[PDB]
Amino acid sequence: IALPAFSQVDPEVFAALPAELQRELKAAYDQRQ
């Protein structure tokens, strides 16, 4: 996390990676929230 990837770029990119990892980037942002 803490990367600019959270910007947007493209959807296919987010869905391209495994949920296990995609959830680590989304959840991490929620944990601190």
UniProtKB/Swiss-Prot annotation:
By sequence similarity, the record places it as follows:
Belongs to the DNA polymerase type-Y family.
Q: What is known of its domains?
A: The C-terminal domain is necessary for protein interactions.
What interactions and quaternary structure are annotated?
A: Monomer. Interacts with the DNA polymerase zeta which is composed of REV3L and MAD2L2; the interaction with MAD2L2 is direct and requires that REV3L is in its closed conformation. Interacts with POLH, POLI and POLK. May bind ITGA3. Interacts with FAAP20/C1orf86.
State the protein's name: DNA repair protein REV1
User: Which species is this record about?
Assistant: Homo sapiens (Human)
Per the UniProt entry, the signal peptide is none
* Its job: Deoxycytidyl transferase involved in DNA repair. Transfers a dCMP residue from dCTP to the 3'-end of a DNA primer in a template-dependent reaction. May assist in the first step in the bypass of abasic lesions by the insertion of a nucleotide opposite the lesion. Required for normal induction of mutations by physical and chemical agents.
Spell out where the chain crosses the membrane: none
Q: Report, as the record phrases it, the tissue specificity of this protein.
A: Ubiquitous.
Where does this protein reside within or beyond the cell?
A: Nucleus
Tell me where on the tree of life, at the top rank, the source sits.
Answer: Eukaryota
